[PDB]
């Protein structure tokens, strides 16, 4: 009784989410470059968000944050291109920390 890939995909939380627009997710900061926080929220691509002015020092590596996803991946096809140009990162708004 081995679970199939279709069963795993059907019950996966990412599939259960549906469209990623305006969905609250829980991300984990894994890299910080000055004021840029690179947050992984379980999607294929991480998001990059500016360190908030309030409680800026409270954001460290491994911090759990509440993000509002706008897109799992930022892609757009431009004039004359044959394939969509992707920046290899998601689009999310950093709300704050989750306790």
């Amino acid at each position: 009784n081995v679970e199939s890939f279709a069963s795993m995909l059907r019950h996966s939380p990412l599939t259960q989410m549906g469209p990623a627009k305006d969905k609250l997710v829980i991300g984990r900061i894994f890299h910080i470059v000055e004021n840029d926080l690179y947050i992984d929220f379980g999607g294929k691509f991480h998001c990059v968000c500016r360190r908030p002015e309030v409680d800026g020092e409270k954001y460290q590596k491994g911090t759990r944050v509440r993000l509002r996803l706008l897109d799992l991946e930022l892609t757009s096809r431009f004039l004359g291109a044959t394939t969509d140009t992707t920046v290899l990162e998601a689009n999310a708004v950093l709300l704050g920390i989750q306790e």
Binding site: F78, L79, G80, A81
Partner: protein, 58 residues
Amino acid sequence: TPSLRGRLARFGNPRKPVLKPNKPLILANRVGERRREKGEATCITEMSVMMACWKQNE
């Protein structure tokens, strides 16, 4: 962004062309240089005031 469907003269496009670009409508990997603004003669009003006062005061 303006539509490009059915604009250029192409096979299968029945209508006459709308756009006739001299260069392919393909994005380049560079932007135009920071074009300078041609300098205009300055302080003309103050020069005029000074010269009018010179004319009045010999």
